[PDB]
Amino acid sequence: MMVWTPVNNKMFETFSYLPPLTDEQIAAQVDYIVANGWIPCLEFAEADKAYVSNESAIRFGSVSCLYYDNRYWTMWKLPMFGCRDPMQVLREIVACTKAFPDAYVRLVAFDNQKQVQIMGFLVQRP
Amino acid sequence: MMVWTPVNNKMFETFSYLPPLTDEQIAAQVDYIVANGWIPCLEFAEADKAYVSNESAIRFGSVSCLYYDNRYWTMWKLPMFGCRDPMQVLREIVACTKAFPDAYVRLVAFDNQKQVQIMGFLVQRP
Amino acid sequence: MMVWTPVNNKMFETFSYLPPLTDEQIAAQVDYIVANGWIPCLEFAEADKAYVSNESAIRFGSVSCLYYDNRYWTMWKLPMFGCRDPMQVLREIVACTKAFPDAYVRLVAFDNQKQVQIMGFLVQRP
Amino acid sequence: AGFKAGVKDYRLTYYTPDYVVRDTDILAAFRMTPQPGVPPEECGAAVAAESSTGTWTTVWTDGLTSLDRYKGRCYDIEPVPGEDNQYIAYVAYPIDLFEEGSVTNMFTSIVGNVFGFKALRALRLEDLRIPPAYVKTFVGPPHGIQVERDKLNKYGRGLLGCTIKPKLGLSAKNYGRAVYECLRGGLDFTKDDENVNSQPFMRWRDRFLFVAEAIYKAQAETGEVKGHYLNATAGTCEEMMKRAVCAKELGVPIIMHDYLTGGFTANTSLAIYCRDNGLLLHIHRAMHAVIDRQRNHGIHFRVLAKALRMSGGDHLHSGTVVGKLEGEREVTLGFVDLMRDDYVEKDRSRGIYFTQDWCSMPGVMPVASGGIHVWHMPALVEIFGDDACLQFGGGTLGHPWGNAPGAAANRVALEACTQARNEGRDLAREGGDVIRSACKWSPELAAACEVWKEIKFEFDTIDKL
């Protein structure tokens, strides 16, 4: 029996339980975005704003249900509407992480027909 | 596209989005106070009391609407009732900032007919 | 006009606005306890438990009115029932402050007919 | 004084041109266009009669009461210069005719039936004199301009807002995303579009929660108080109140209501709720131009603005003058004073037919919104001064770099104009120079300046004095 550690073992949603994505594996995910016509977007957060938290509920009555702080991160530029070139997405990952080398950075993609984010994973951890 | 940084980018209301006010620009604002017959006043706060916060809402029921801590700062002396000399105002800015060199300091002015603060901007950052 | 500083200026109720009590002045207050037949007692608190705070109101509904944490401090031994000797009160002050040299320490006295604390002042600051 | 059955002219009872108006009378100025063959005196008298105590034939029950005490009175008629069949008819209404605190009741008398009379071709209510004794029966605005600035801790410049776009079709989470990005760049406020209520693409409570997250995120990031006007406009008063309650329980600062499409009865209730619970109330004037656009018929916006001040609102849209929706300068300056000030003297050059004494009822913040961008900033600051909210929806969400840069561009433009004005610069003459200078400095502003440099809205005005 191996014990799953509770210490320093925070996760970042999809693909957090796999080995860290290689550059090739990230590029394959970008290809999947482009193949399905989805809208790439980058988002980032400083460490203090990267993890779900509850501090704004101090201002509430009994209405905290499915309210959390830090679900929203900061948009890098705009969603890449009309982008069908995986190399452009990869270049923006480089630019975002260059500008914010200490930030958490995630690559997401939007579907405008379901009007929902349809993929996402972390591409940089401080 | 340039990205507006979310990191270490806190603001202090009027004139925070312009270049730092030189002394001449500050003096010009003082002249506008005097030209309009408004009442100059200085206010200051230590860094821990300078930024809007929510900690007193722990004591509340569902009445936090438009309640924030740290809107009030500390008054420097009294409002300069009857002051029509810009150099007196400028001297008080120097005196306040010398007494509290690590404080945030703002110059405000009051209109007693509207009974409201009618101008204000930061003159000192720690 | 002199400006009353808001920074690092916390007070401790009765006699905080006077010059620090001399040993003669403390002795005179102990005499007043004994002359009036009141019950001397010492109380102490570590720095984190010395000032009024509000943390327990997180567990409350709308019932925080006149509830504060840290009004109670820790009793030194027991109230000195039957003490009519100022030497004994001054001895315990020394004893309490030697045992807890990093603590805030206050001397209080109780009136059992009103059933209320009838005097009190800080005798030690960390 | 015997009862005599049958029809007689309205002017025998209701045209009293030597009447001295009382200081408690409500006065109305009607722009009246009679049918051919109907004398102006009779037309004015019919308007007075059928908005007060009279009907088309003599009734015996008049004799049980005192028609002298209660009747509306056409007390003056003046021909309109430039018009051969238009008149201004002035009618005085005893204060006893009106239900205390009810804009609904006041409108029901004054504009209830008279606009449909066959004997007139057109009728426009231009102004109302609301006497202090009637003003004092209203709760009025929840807070008003001074209190709003004090609650927000915001002084020394116009407030800045922004309607989220597309008007409809965004999800709740995308709404909050857009809001966060707008607020964090320097806007004080964002808002639901007037028609964003609760719909299949976005249900209201979902939006309220995600907007709350965005408000608090932008406030923590910037250190400035933020708000987003969450729309309480609803199909029923119960749904309106549920939405106001949710805003209260989220601790957020401001809601909005569409006072004309929701209606005065619901608006007044909501204003009272906002007073009792500390919420700012933004009022959107949706539908007003159905009523107020044409010079010959309807109700001038200045009357709709007085009515809102009475029913209650902390903000009210005032037009822009220079944007996509109509609002002539002098007309607009006049009703802005009527919205904000305590005492406004008669001034027909600004369309103010009556001296208006508000007897300390709080002033309403004018909101300039619709088709404005950074190059309009000097004109807006010049027209409105500091006590206004200037809103840039397309002018923020249409910035080429996104909402935060769009917000920053507007905030820089406003602050640069405000600083220039304070330094002695004439924004009417030097406004373009002020903006051009700030464009060169701020990259975010420069991008807005370039995209909207040639965009103006200059058309013939319909609502002319």
Ligand SMILES: O=C(O)[C@@](O)(COP(=O)(O)O)[C@H](O)[C@H](O)COP(=O)(O)O
């Ligand atoms: O729906 C609109 O068009 C707006 O959201 C403005 O959008 P933009 O900022 O994108 O123009 C406002 O509601 C109008 O200003 C209302 O008109 P008014 O203020 O005249 O009542």
Ligand SMILES: [Mg+2]
């Ligand atoms: Mg709108």
